[PDB]
């Protein structure tokens, strides 16, 4: 037939598109999270040196 | 997770459904074979009625 | 027919789950990156305050 092929292929394409988009988003989320952790760690030391400067 | 058991459930649903699909495929297929044999013996009947009718008419 | 509809329904369940996961991951990325950039701005303000204290 004809309809089954096109509908099935389009739906599988939709699933694959959503999956890859989710993977890209999660990768960027993990990278941003680690960079945020770095920012926290540096900010604490910045606060410590600021406190010493103020003393 | 709930998604895992849901996935397994719709999975076995697909499995049983395609199983019954192929099953009624086979059943209706046997029925079509029987109907084809019916058509064949039917044409045999047409030919035999034709020849005997033609003999009578002769 | 019969099995074809069920197979389509399976292909649609995969569609919904993949699309929902993609959208949720995208929202997670947006939230995480906003968190990181706000932390970076806080770090910048701390640097400027340290500069004023140094002056």
List, comma-separated, the residues after which chain C is broken, a break being a C to N distance over 2.5 A; otherwise answer none. Answer: none
Helix/strand/coil for B38 = helix
CB contact (8 A) between residue C10 and residue B14? yes
CA distances in angstroms from B14 to A55, B4, B8, C5, listed in the order given: 71, 15, 10, 9
Contact residues, C window 13-42, toward B, CB-based 8 Å cutoff: 13, 17
CB contact under 8 A, C17 and B3: yes
Cα–Cα distance measured from residue C40 to residue C55, given in angstroms and rounded to the nearest whole number? 23
Closest of C7, A4, A11, A1 to residue B22, by C-alpha: C7
Measured in residues, chain A has a length of: 55
Asked if residue A5 lies in contact with residue C11, where contact means CB atoms within 8 angstroms, the answer is no
Resolution at which this structure was determined, Å: 5.1
As for chain B, the residues directly before each break of C–N over 2.5 Å are none
- Our answer on whether B and C touch (3+ beta-carbon pairs < 8 Å) is yes
Quick one: which of B52, A36, B6 has its CA closest to C13?
B6
Q: Tell me whether C11 touches chain B (CB under 8 Å).
A: no
Residue with tokens 């099953």: B23
Length of chain B: 58
Give, rounded to a whole angstrom, the gap between the first and last alpha carbons of chain A. 82
In angstroms, the CA B27 to CA C7 distance is 20
The token duo for B51 is 């020849």
Do residues B26 and C2 touch, judged by C-beta distance below 8 A?
Answer: no
DSSP state of B51: H
Give Cβ neighbours of residue A24 (< 8 Å, ≥ 6 apart): none
Estimate the crossing angle of helix A3-54 against helix C3-54, to 10 degrees. Answer: 20
């Amino acid at each position: 037939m004809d309809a089954i092929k096109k509908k099935m292929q389009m739906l599988k394409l939709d699933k694959e598109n959503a999956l890859d988009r989710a993977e890209q988003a999660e990768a960027d989320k993990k990278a941003a999270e680690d960079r945020s952790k770095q920012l926290e760690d540096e900010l604490v030391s910045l606060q410590k040196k600021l406190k010493g400067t103020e003393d | 997770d709930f998604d895992d058991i849901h996935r397994k459930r719709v999975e076995k649903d697909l499995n049983e459904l395609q199983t019954l699909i192929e099953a009624h495929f086979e059943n209706r297929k046997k029925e079509e074979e029987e109907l084809i044999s019916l058509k064949d013996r039917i044409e045999k009947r047409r030919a035999e009625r034709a020849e005997q009718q033609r003999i009578r008419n002769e």
